[PDB]
Amino acid sequence: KVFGRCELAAAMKRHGLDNYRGYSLGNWVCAAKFESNFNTQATNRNTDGSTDYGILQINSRWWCNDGRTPGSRNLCNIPCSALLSSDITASVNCAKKIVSDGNGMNAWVAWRNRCKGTDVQAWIRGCRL
């Protein structure tokens, strides 16, 4: 599913992401925009053989099992395919573990490079939340 900006903001808010570990909603919508262009079905392969999955491009080296990433840790305890669903529940629950890991949202390279220190509130402007 390709989310609309406000539709995604609303789903993320409902799933408890607004101010999760201090990160306002706009940070989450911005990261989703540049990681996946709001497409739950986005996959991207890395040079190390791991793959990134879903709206928040969660990586198979640490977080999920895809059966093809030797020495993967599967920390979210989830097949990576579950991260491609039109229901964002699995992605959100896994992202909560990631952002709690010590590096906050810096774990998402597009967030560090394209959202961090920008006016992220702009991403939720005009939305009915």
Active site residue ranges: 35, 52
- Helix, strand, or coil here: 71? coil
Q: What's the token pair of residue 59?
A: 């990586």
* Residue 101 assigned ligand-binding role: yes
CA distance 7 to 39: 12
CA distance 122 to 129: 14
CA distance 129 to 6: 8
CA distance 34 to 55: 9
Binding residues for substrate: 101
Binding residues: 101
